[PDB]
Amino acid sequence: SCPHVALLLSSGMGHLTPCLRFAATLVQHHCRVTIITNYPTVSVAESRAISLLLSDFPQITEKQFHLLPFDPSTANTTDPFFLRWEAIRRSAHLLNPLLSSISPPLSALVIDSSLVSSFVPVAANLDLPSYVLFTSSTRMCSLEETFPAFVASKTNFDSIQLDDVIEIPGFSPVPVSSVPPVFLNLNHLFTTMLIQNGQSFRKANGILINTFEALEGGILPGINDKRAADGLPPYCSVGPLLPCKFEKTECSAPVKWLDDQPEGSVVYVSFGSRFALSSEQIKELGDGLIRSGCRFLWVVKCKKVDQEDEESLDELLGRDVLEKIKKYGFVIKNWVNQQEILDHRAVGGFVTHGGWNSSMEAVWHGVPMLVWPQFGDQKINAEVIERSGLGMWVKRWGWGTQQLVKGEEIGERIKDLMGNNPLRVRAKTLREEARKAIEVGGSSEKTLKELIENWK
Amino acid sequence: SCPHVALLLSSGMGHLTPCLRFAATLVQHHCRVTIITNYPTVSVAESRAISLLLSDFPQITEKQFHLLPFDPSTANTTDPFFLRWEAIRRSAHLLNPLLSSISPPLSALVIDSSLVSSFVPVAANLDLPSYVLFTSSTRMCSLEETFPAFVASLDDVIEIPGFSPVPVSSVPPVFLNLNHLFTTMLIQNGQSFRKANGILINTFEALEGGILPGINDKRAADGLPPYCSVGPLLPCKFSAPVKWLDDQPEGSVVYVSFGSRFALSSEQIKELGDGLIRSGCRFLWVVKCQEDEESLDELLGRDVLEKIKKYGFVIKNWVNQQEILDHRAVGGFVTHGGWNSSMEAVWHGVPMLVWPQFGDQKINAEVIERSGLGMWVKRWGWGTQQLVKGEEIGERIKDLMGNNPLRVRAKTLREEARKAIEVGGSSEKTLKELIENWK
Ligand SMILES: O=c1ccn([C@@H]2O[C@H](COP(=O)(O)OP(=O)(O)O[C@H]3O[C@H](CO)[C@@H](O)[C@H](O)[C@H]3O)[C@@H](O)[C@H]2O)c(=O)[nH]1
Ligand SMILES: O=c1ccn([C@@H]2O[C@H](COP(=O)(O)OP(=O)(O)O[C@H]3O[C@H](CO)[C@@H](O)[C@H](O)[C@H]3O)[C@@H](O)[C@H]2O)c(=O)[nH]1
């Protein structure tokens, strides 16, 4: 028997990447994977990823979910990715015919974390075991579970709220300063969805996380038996989730440029797929990279959605400035193969926004990190990284969205990143442990095997 | 459920390519696949290929087959690949525990066309349904099955079922040389094809008329195992010559390769180089002389080597033939007529000039010629047997490049081949039915 698993995706590369990689892992562990997609994708990158995955894996079936006509006026945010999540969630009662059509009969439904609350009852109607796919760190999962109780505890998130902690079971408490800024905005669409989903994580048969136990002390078994005692579903560490072979094109111009550089001399700089720095910050970062005195590779976005970023970098920085920066290092306003870049020998360090996918990529490839949180989960994930010893995160810089950092200080901190030996020593060890987790008999291998063995 | 299929390989890239590609295919059709391998492989290509497949497909298990120690004293042939088949065949009794060992329970076993006679009984003992993986054309398979009865019974017609006759001229030369290792082994295999449950052939119906579905009912009447067409077997997901090809106009390059295990005479290499220069066309030339340490500079010369480089691309190495054939610049293919390269040309829609040198090629060429996709010079005979001068070569290449009906046929047949393995297609259907019966 080869267990049938259907995966329910949402919008956004941050959510999509671990879903596709998990599909690849499942297929490569003798399971039937069917992906439930929706179109048109908010960004091209998503569509391309789906197409490539399908071309490499013809045995994965794709069922398109047809969303009900959507009225954006009802929605609180102008953010496309969130808007799509809600668009899917409002057409939840039409998953039932979809799922009923599928053959062979389904063993399991993996549902994205963003759409849990709306779609877990649909899985209940058909006696379908449901598992949430969690795209962020474990600490963040706990925070998301604990948050609804916390907002229920308070009269209002008024000025009474200062930077004091939120209690998390089995974890170090989280300061309000590290808490996602949108959380304080109750009635924000994302916040509403987060309260609902965080409330609904308990309903699923299990919570899948992209991590390994060594990455976060040895707290996870204890937390899990405690959860079992309280009747909560278990955390399943199935990470690190390995990139597919299609994610590697060894003929990229950035890679070719990287080949001619001294080893461990390049600094990689990127801030995710769904977020663009402010113009001032782009300029100052430009200054800082030159001021660092190091070789660098810089991925710039001037808009969140890749389709919309028509503007050239010649428009913002302008004329001779961009040329000047170009002399010092590789600059690009285009989609790059990031994992492939992280594996390169020339790359000594990573300036990241703290997104969990890229963070885990650096953990897997053993690249020291300089974390520059911008919003959301990223101040928490940062902390994790810092505790691992693989990276450092500058607290003086605060949130990137609400604070500006000048070129000089950027330069100095980058120099700090390049000079730090302990980070590099830890990188190797944590890298090898990361390997051991997914080796046969590893934590993640054991967990995965158990999951499939339940299905069975 | 995930049916478990075993692939029994034999030495030879020509046999191994369809094997590995069939592993990929079966995996892609929700089957578990275990490959049975033997070491040390004769050539590096086989080893590296297996490595690449196993790397790209972690869900495929590899079971090393150990063989009885063999003496090359008989050795009716000096061919390494053919000798390997004797090595594996003589150790057939060692196969039973091996095949009994694999879990989950095998639902079927696929065995190479070279070792059928000796390894089809092993299946019967374990109630294991067995299929033969045939590498060559439908016509050639028919001939192989038809030959034993023919030996039991000059350049005239040999009897074939469900097909136009074959001139003994077209018959592989080694058939005449009885008590050759190849001939003997083959005589053993052909009479044993019937023991197998089905015949897996890399082909589609549109490639050889509308007779293919009928030969199956006709065979069913005679109690013969059906011919199951699973082709075209697509290449698997696993740069300098390509980089050169990108600087070239569309349909302006002639591609020249004569297979994995064959090498031209020095004289013929000289004359082919001459014909390539005299052709007036850009070209990519793949040269063969694993034991090939001597540079092309040695054989051709150094002063001679420089002249050819000016008008084309010359290489003495393994190439990604399919990657080169899918390219737009390549307007035509000069091939030996092997079934894999021919099939890749059909898939990439490349017009071809066939130059049969030995083996099954003479049949294949006909098929090629019969399809309208390519042209073959009957005048040239066997390349191993005959030498051709530069003028004829160049002129004939000009004929190939100038040929426009071939391009049309190439497009249309590319479409047929594509439609074959799409859902509802003739080729995919037979696969679906096969896997459905496993069950
Ligand atoms: O030029 C690029 C840009 C992005 N990526 C990939 O995009 C993926 C996702 O990036 P990620 O690190 O997850 O951050 P974001 O997707 O931009 O942002 C949100 O996406 C996830 C949602 O759970 C969270 O991990 C993040 O904290 C959250 O900020 C990574 O694997 C990157 O390798 C590339 O390969 N090339
Ligand atoms: O430089 C090279 C040479 C060969 N190939 C590949 O080798 C494969 C097999 O070659 P093939 O066309 O099958 O001919 P051979 O293997 O050299 O010769 C024997 O191999 C097969 C055994 O059945 C038959 O198809 C042939 O007629 C028979 O002559 C092809 O797919 C080619 O793509 C390459 O990729 N690069």
Short mmCIF file of C-alpha atoms in Angstrom, two decimals, chain B residues 40-424:
data_model
loop_
_atom_site.label_atom_id
_atom_site.label_comp_id
_atom_site.label_asym_id
_atom_site.label_seq_id
_atom_site.Cartn_x
_atom_site.Cartn_y
_atom_site.Cartn_z
CA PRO B 40 32.15 -4.33 -12.32
CA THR B 41 30.36 -2.88 -15.35
CA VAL B 42 32.17 -3.11 -18.69
CA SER B 43 32.10 0.64 -19.38
CA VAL B 44 32.08 3.76 -17.20
CA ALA B 45 28.87 5.08 -18.77
CA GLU B 46 26.80 2.27 -17.28
CA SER B 47 28.10 2.77 -13.74
CA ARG B 48 27.76 6.56 -13.86
CA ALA B 49 24.26 6.24 -15.30
CA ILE B 50 23.11 3.89 -12.54
CA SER B 51 24.61 6.32 -10.04
CA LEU B 52 22.67 9.22 -11.56
CA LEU B 53 19.38 7.31 -11.58
CA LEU B 54 19.80 6.15 -7.98
CA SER B 55 20.70 9.72 -7.03
CA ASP B 56 17.69 11.27 -8.76
CA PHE B 57 15.39 8.49 -7.54
CA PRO B 58 15.92 7.68 -3.84
CA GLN B 59 12.74 5.58 -4.04
CA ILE B 60 14.52 3.00 -6.21
CA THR B 61 16.34 0.12 -4.51
CA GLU B 62 19.52 -1.45 -5.91
CA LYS B 63 20.27 -5.15 -5.46
CA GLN B 64 23.74 -6.23 -6.56
CA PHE B 65 23.69 -9.54 -8.43
CA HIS B 66 26.75 -11.70 -7.82
CA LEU B 67 27.76 -14.10 -10.58
CA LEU B 68 29.59 -17.40 -10.78
CA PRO B 69 33.27 -17.00 -11.70
CA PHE B 70 33.57 -17.21 -15.49
CA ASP B 71 36.37 -18.40 -17.76
CA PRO B 72 36.76 -16.53 -21.06
CA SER B 73 38.02 -19.68 -22.80
CA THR B 74 34.68 -20.12 -24.58
CA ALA B 75 34.31 -17.12 -25.20
CA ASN B 76 32.97 -17.85 -28.66
CA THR B 77 33.20 -14.07 -28.88
CA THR B 78 35.85 -11.60 -27.77
CA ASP B 79 33.21 -8.94 -27.16
CA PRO B 80 33.17 -7.86 -23.50
CA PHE B 81 29.46 -6.94 -23.41
CA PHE B 82 28.41 -10.20 -25.02
CA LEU B 83 30.72 -12.12 -22.68
CA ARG B 84 29.11 -10.47 -19.66
CA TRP B 85 25.79 -11.93 -20.79
CA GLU B 86 27.38 -15.37 -20.59
CA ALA B 87 28.67 -14.49 -17.13
CA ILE B 88 25.20 -13.55 -15.87
CA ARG B 89 23.42 -16.37 -17.72
CA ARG B 90 25.72 -19.09 -16.38
CA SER B 91 24.94 -17.92 -12.83
CA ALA B 92 21.16 -18.07 -13.28
CA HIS B 93 20.62 -20.46 -10.36
CA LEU B 94 21.99 -17.78 -8.01
CA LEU B 95 19.01 -15.59 -8.91
CA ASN B 96 16.28 -17.48 -7.04
CA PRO B 97 17.26 -16.55 -3.47
CA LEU B 98 18.05 -12.97 -4.53
CA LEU B 99 14.61 -12.49 -6.06
CA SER B 100 12.95 -14.27 -3.15
CA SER B 101 14.64 -11.87 -0.72
CA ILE B 102 13.23 -8.50 -1.81
CA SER B 103 10.30 -7.04 0.15
CA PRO B 104 7.53 -6.11 -0.44
CA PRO B 105 6.56 -9.13 -2.63
CA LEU B 106 7.41 -8.60 -6.29
CA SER B 107 4.35 -8.48 -8.51
CA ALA B 108 6.33 -8.85 -11.73
CA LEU B 109 9.89 -9.19 -13.03
CA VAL B 110 11.32 -7.44 -16.09
CA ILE B 111 14.26 -9.22 -17.74
CA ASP B 112 16.56 -8.05 -20.56
CA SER B 113 16.03 -9.45 -24.08
CA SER B 114 19.57 -10.83 -24.02
CA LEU B 115 19.08 -13.12 -21.02
CA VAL B 116 15.45 -14.20 -21.49
CA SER B 117 15.92 -17.92 -22.15
CA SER B 118 17.92 -18.46 -18.99
CA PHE B 119 16.02 -16.16 -16.62
CA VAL B 120 12.39 -16.71 -17.61
CA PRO B 121 12.34 -20.08 -15.83
CA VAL B 122 13.36 -18.42 -12.53
CA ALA B 123 10.11 -16.47 -12.67
CA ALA B 124 7.94 -19.55 -13.23
CA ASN B 125 9.27 -21.15 -10.05
CA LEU B 126 8.21 -18.22 -7.88
CA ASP B 127 4.85 -17.70 -9.60
CA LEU B 128 6.39 -14.41 -10.67
CA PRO B 129 4.91 -12.96 -13.87
CA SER B 130 7.73 -11.98 -16.22
CA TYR B 131 8.06 -9.43 -19.00
CA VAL B 132 10.91 -9.06 -21.48
CA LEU B 133 12.34 -5.59 -22.08
CA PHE B 134 13.14 -5.45 -25.79
CA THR B 135 15.48 -2.67 -26.86
CA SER B 136 15.08 -2.82 -30.64
CA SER B 137 12.33 -2.38 -33.22
CA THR B 138 9.11 -4.37 -33.63
CA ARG B 139 10.43 -5.78 -36.91
CA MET B 140 13.66 -6.93 -35.27
CA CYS B 141 11.83 -8.49 -32.32
CA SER B 142 9.63 -10.38 -34.77
CA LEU B 143 12.76 -11.58 -36.55
CA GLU B 144 14.35 -12.76 -33.31
CA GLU B 145 11.26 -14.77 -32.43
CA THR B 146 11.03 -16.13 -35.98
CA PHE B 147 14.64 -17.20 -36.50
CA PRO B 148 14.91 -20.48 -34.51
CA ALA B 149 12.19 -22.19 -36.56
CA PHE B 150 14.08 -20.92 -39.59
CA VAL B 151 17.40 -22.52 -38.61
CA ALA B 152 15.56 -25.75 -37.78
CA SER B 153 14.18 -25.80 -41.34
CA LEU B 154 21.77 -17.19 -49.77
CA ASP B 155 20.58 -13.59 -50.01
CA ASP B 156 16.85 -14.24 -50.21
CA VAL B 157 13.75 -13.73 -48.07
CA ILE B 158 13.44 -14.94 -44.48
CA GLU B 159 9.95 -15.67 -43.12
CA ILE B 160 8.47 -13.15 -40.68
CA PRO B 161 5.06 -13.04 -38.98
CA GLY B 162 2.84 -9.97 -39.32
CA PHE B 163 5.40 -8.18 -41.44
CA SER B 164 7.00 -7.67 -44.84
CA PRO B 165 9.81 -10.20 -45.42
CA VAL B 166 13.43 -9.58 -44.61
CA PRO B 167 16.23 -10.06 -47.12
CA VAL B 168 19.06 -12.03 -45.51
CA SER B 169 21.11 -9.03 -46.65
CA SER B 170 19.20 -7.03 -44.03
CA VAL B 171 19.58 -9.84 -41.48
CA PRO B 172 22.34 -9.20 -38.91
CA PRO B 173 25.53 -10.87 -40.26
CA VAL B 174 26.20 -12.80 -37.05
CA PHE B 175 23.02 -14.80 -37.64
CA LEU B 176 24.79 -16.55 -40.49
CA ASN B 177 27.82 -17.31 -38.34
CA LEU B 178 26.17 -20.03 -36.27
CA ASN B 179 27.81 -21.23 -33.06
CA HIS B 180 28.93 -17.68 -32.42
CA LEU B 181 28.19 -16.76 -28.80
CA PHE B 182 25.69 -14.10 -29.84
CA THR B 183 23.97 -16.32 -32.40
CA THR B 184 23.73 -19.30 -30.03
CA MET B 185 22.44 -17.26 -27.09
CA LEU B 186 19.94 -15.52 -29.36
CA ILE B 187 18.67 -18.82 -30.77
CA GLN B 188 18.11 -19.81 -27.16
CA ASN B 189 16.28 -16.56 -26.35
CA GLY B 190 13.92 -16.34 -29.33
CA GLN B 191 12.34 -19.72 -28.62
CA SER B 192 11.91 -18.55 -25.03
CA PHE B 193 10.22 -15.19 -25.67
CA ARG B 194 6.95 -17.13 -25.72
CA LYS B 195 7.53 -18.21 -22.11
CA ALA B 196 7.40 -14.59 -20.98
CA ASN B 197 4.04 -13.00 -20.24
CA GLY B 198 4.50 -9.94 -22.44
CA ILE B 199 6.96 -8.07 -24.63
CA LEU B 200 7.92 -4.51 -23.70
CA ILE B 201 8.90 -2.58 -26.82
CA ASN B 202 10.05 1.02 -26.97
CA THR B 203 7.67 2.19 -29.68
CA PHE B 204 4.28 3.60 -30.54
CA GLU B 205 1.73 2.47 -33.11
CA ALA B 206 2.01 5.57 -35.32
CA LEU B 207 5.69 4.72 -35.81
CA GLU B 208 4.86 1.51 -37.68
CA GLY B 209 1.41 1.66 -39.26
CA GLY B 210 -1.89 0.55 -37.76
CA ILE B 211 -0.93 -3.11 -37.77
CA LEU B 212 0.36 -3.14 -34.19
CA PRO B 213 -3.00 -3.60 -32.50
CA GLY B 214 -3.85 -6.42 -34.91
CA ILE B 215 -0.66 -8.43 -34.48
CA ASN B 216 -1.76 -8.72 -30.87
CA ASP B 217 -5.08 -10.40 -31.63
CA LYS B 218 -3.37 -12.52 -34.24
CA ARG B 219 -0.80 -13.50 -31.61
CA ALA B 220 -3.56 -14.10 -29.08
CA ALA B 221 -5.00 -16.62 -31.52
CA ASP B 222 -1.67 -18.46 -31.61
CA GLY B 223 -1.32 -18.36 -27.83
CA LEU B 224 1.67 -16.02 -28.03
CA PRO B 225 2.47 -13.38 -25.39
CA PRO B 226 1.19 -9.93 -26.50
CA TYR B 227 3.45 -7.14 -27.74
CA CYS B 228 3.15 -4.25 -25.29
CA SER B 229 4.27 -0.89 -26.69
CA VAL B 230 5.33 1.43 -23.87
CA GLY B 231 7.41 3.82 -25.98
CA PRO B 232 8.65 6.39 -26.53
CA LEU B 233 10.68 5.99 -23.33
CA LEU B 234 11.50 9.58 -22.40
CA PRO B 235 15.03 10.49 -21.28
CA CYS B 236 15.49 11.09 -17.55
CA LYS B 237 15.99 14.34 -15.66
CA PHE B 238 19.64 13.47 -15.05
CA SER B 239 27.50 22.31 -21.76
CA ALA B 240 30.42 23.41 -23.95
CA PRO B 241 29.03 21.68 -27.06
CA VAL B 242 25.60 23.13 -26.28
CA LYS B 243 27.21 26.55 -25.79
CA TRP B 244 28.71 26.19 -29.26
CA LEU B 245 25.31 25.11 -30.60
CA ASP B 246 23.66 28.28 -29.30
CA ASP B 247 25.83 30.42 -31.57
CA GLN B 248 24.48 28.55 -34.58
CA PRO B 249 21.59 29.26 -37.01
CA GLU B 250 18.46 27.12 -36.85
CA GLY B 251 18.43 23.84 -38.77
CA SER B 252 21.95 24.48 -40.05
CA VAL B 253 23.89 21.85 -38.12
CA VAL B 254 24.46 18.20 -39.00
CA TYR B 255 24.85 15.85 -36.04
CA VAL B 256 27.14 12.84 -36.35
CA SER B 257 27.33 9.99 -33.84
CA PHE B 258 27.65 6.22 -34.27
CA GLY B 259 26.61 4.85 -30.88
CA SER B 260 28.29 3.99 -27.60
CA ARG B 261 30.21 0.81 -28.41
CA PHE B 262 31.38 1.18 -32.01
CA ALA B 263 34.49 2.72 -33.56
CA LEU B 264 35.22 3.51 -37.20
CA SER B 265 38.36 2.46 -39.04
CA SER B 266 41.00 5.20 -39.19
CA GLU B 267 40.56 5.40 -42.96
CA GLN B 268 36.81 5.90 -42.58
CA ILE B 269 37.34 8.56 -39.92
CA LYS B 270 39.57 10.39 -42.39
CA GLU B 271 37.02 10.07 -45.19
CA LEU B 272 34.10 11.10 -42.99
CA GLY B 273 36.04 14.17 -41.89
CA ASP B 274 36.65 14.85 -45.56
CA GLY B 275 32.94 14.53 -46.31
CA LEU B 276 32.08 16.81 -43.41
CA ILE B 277 34.39 19.53 -44.69
CA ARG B 278 33.12 19.00 -48.23
CA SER B 279 29.49 19.07 -47.13
CA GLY B 280 29.40 22.84 -46.76
CA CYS B 281 27.38 22.50 -43.56
CA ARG B 282 28.13 23.25 -39.92
CA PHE B 283 28.41 20.07 -37.85
CA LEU B 284 28.81 18.50 -34.44
CA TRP B 285 30.90 15.34 -34.65
CA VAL B 286 31.24 12.83 -31.82
CA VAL B 287 34.35 10.68 -32.18
CA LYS B 288 35.06 7.19 -30.88
CA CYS B 289 38.30 5.26 -31.39
CA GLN B 290 36.71 3.92 -21.93
CA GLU B 291 40.03 2.58 -23.20
CA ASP B 292 40.17 5.60 -25.52
CA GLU B 293 43.19 7.43 -24.11
CA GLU B 294 44.79 8.34 -27.44
CA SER B 295 43.86 11.85 -28.57
CA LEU B 296 42.08 12.46 -31.88
CA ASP B 297 45.26 14.39 -32.65
CA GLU B 298 47.11 11.07 -32.81
CA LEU B 299 44.86 9.30 -35.30
CA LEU B 300 43.86 12.29 -37.42
CA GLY B 301 47.06 14.28 -37.11
CA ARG B 302 47.64 17.77 -35.73
CA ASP B 303 47.83 19.70 -38.99
CA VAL B 304 44.75 17.75 -40.09
CA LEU B 305 42.95 18.35 -36.79
CA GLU B 306 43.11 22.13 -37.16
CA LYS B 307 41.37 22.33 -40.54
CA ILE B 308 38.21 20.52 -39.41
CA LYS B 309 37.91 22.67 -36.29
CA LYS B 310 37.47 25.79 -38.42
CA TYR B 311 34.28 24.52 -40.06
CA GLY B 312 32.80 22.49 -37.20
CA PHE B 313 32.81 21.02 -33.72
CA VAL B 314 34.87 17.87 -33.15
CA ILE B 315 34.78 15.90 -29.91
CA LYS B 316 35.97 12.53 -28.62
CA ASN B 317 33.81 12.06 -25.53
CA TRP B 318 30.45 10.96 -24.17
CA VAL B 319 27.79 13.50 -25.10
CA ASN B 320 24.24 14.17 -24.02
CA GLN B 321 22.84 13.05 -27.36
CA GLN B 322 19.26 13.94 -26.41
CA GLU B 323 20.25 17.40 -25.16
CA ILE B 324 21.93 18.00 -28.49
CA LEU B 325 18.99 16.62 -30.49
CA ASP B 326 16.38 18.73 -28.69
CA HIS B 327 18.38 21.81 -29.71
CA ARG B 328 17.04 24.03 -32.50
CA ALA B 329 20.31 24.43 -34.41
CA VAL B 330 20.48 20.72 -35.22
CA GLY B 331 18.75 20.24 -38.57
CA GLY B 332 19.80 16.63 -39.08
CA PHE B 333 21.30 13.47 -37.65
CA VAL B 334 23.82 11.07 -39.17
CA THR B 335 23.35 7.89 -37.13
CA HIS B 336 24.33 4.22 -37.21
CA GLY B 337 20.69 3.20 -36.88
CA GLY B 338 20.59 2.01 -33.29
CA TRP B 339 17.12 2.05 -31.77
CA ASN B 340 17.81 4.44 -28.89
CA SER B 341 19.36 7.20 -30.99
CA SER B 342 16.75 6.70 -33.70
CA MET B 343 13.98 6.95 -31.10
CA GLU B 344 15.51 10.10 -29.63
CA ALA B 345 15.55 11.55 -33.14
CA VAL B 346 11.86 10.64 -33.54
CA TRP B 347 11.16 12.32 -30.21
CA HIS B 348 13.12 15.50 -30.94
CA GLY B 349 11.91 15.44 -34.55
CA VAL B 350 15.32 15.35 -36.22
CA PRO B 351 15.60 14.22 -39.87
CA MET B 352 18.23 11.49 -40.19
CA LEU B 353 20.67 9.94 -42.65
CA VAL B 354 21.10 6.31 -41.62
CA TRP B 355 24.42 4.53 -42.14
CA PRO B 356 23.95 0.89 -41.02
CA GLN B 357 27.23 -0.55 -39.72
CA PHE B 358 26.15 -3.82 -38.10
CA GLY B 359 23.54 -5.56 -35.97
CA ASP B 360 19.84 -4.72 -36.03
CA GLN B 361 20.51 -1.44 -37.83
CA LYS B 362 19.68 -2.71 -41.34
CA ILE B 363 16.16 -3.54 -40.16
CA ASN B 364 15.90 -0.29 -38.20
CA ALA B 365 17.02 1.78 -41.18
CA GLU B 366 14.20 0.24 -43.22
CA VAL B 367 11.72 1.20 -40.52
CA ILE B 368 13.22 4.66 -40.42
CA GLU B 369 13.09 4.83 -44.18
CA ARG B 370 9.58 3.39 -44.01
CA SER B 371 8.43 6.04 -41.58
CA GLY B 372 9.51 8.82 -43.92
CA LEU B 373 11.48 10.43 -41.12
CA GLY B 374 14.88 9.53 -42.55
CA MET B 375 16.83 8.32 -45.58
CA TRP B 376 19.33 5.48 -45.79
CA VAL B 377 21.82 4.69 -48.55
CA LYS B 378 21.45 1.03 -49.49
CA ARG B 379 24.46 1.54 -51.76
CA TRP B 380 26.76 2.03 -48.77
CA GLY B 381 25.94 -1.39 -47.34
CA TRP B 382 27.56 -2.18 -43.99
CA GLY B 383 29.95 0.47 -42.71
CA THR B 384 31.97 -2.27 -41.04
CA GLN B 385 32.08 -4.16 -44.32
CA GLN B 386 32.54 -1.24 -46.71
CA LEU B 387 34.45 2.05 -46.93
CA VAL B 388 32.90 5.22 -48.35
CA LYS B 389 34.88 8.14 -49.81
CA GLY B 390 34.50 11.82 -48.95
CA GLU B 391 32.64 12.97 -52.08
CA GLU B 392 29.73 10.55 -51.63
CA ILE B 393 29.48 11.43 -47.94
CA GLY B 394 29.43 15.19 -48.52
CA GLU B 395 26.95 14.96 -51.38
CA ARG B 396 24.62 12.70 -49.39
CA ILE B 397 24.78 15.05 -46.41
CA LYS B 398 23.79 17.89 -48.73
CA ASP B 399 20.87 15.70 -49.78
CA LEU B 400 19.85 15.26 -46.15
CA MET B 401 20.05 18.95 -45.25
CA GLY B 402 18.28 20.02 -48.42
CA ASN B 403 15.48 17.58 -47.66
CA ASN B 404 12.23 19.32 -46.73
CA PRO B 405 9.72 16.43 -46.75
CA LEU B 406 11.80 14.93 -43.93
CA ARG B 407 11.23 18.02 -41.79
CA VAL B 408 7.46 17.85 -42.30
CA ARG B 409 7.39 14.16 -41.46
CA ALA B 410 9.59 14.92 -38.45
CA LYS B 411 7.13 17.48 -37.08
CA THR B 412 4.04 15.35 -37.65
CA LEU B 413 5.66 12.25 -36.17
CA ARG B 414 6.93 14.29 -33.22
CA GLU B 415 3.29 15.16 -32.62
CA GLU B 416 2.26 11.51 -32.92
CA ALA B 417 4.98 10.49 -30.46
CA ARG B 418 3.95 13.21 -28.00
CA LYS B 419 0.27 12.27 -28.24
CA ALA B 420 1.19 8.61 -27.69
CA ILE B 421 2.33 9.08 -24.08
CA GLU B 422 -0.25 11.69 -23.13
CA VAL B 423 -3.45 10.57 -21.40
CA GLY B 424 -5.74 8.79 -23.84
#
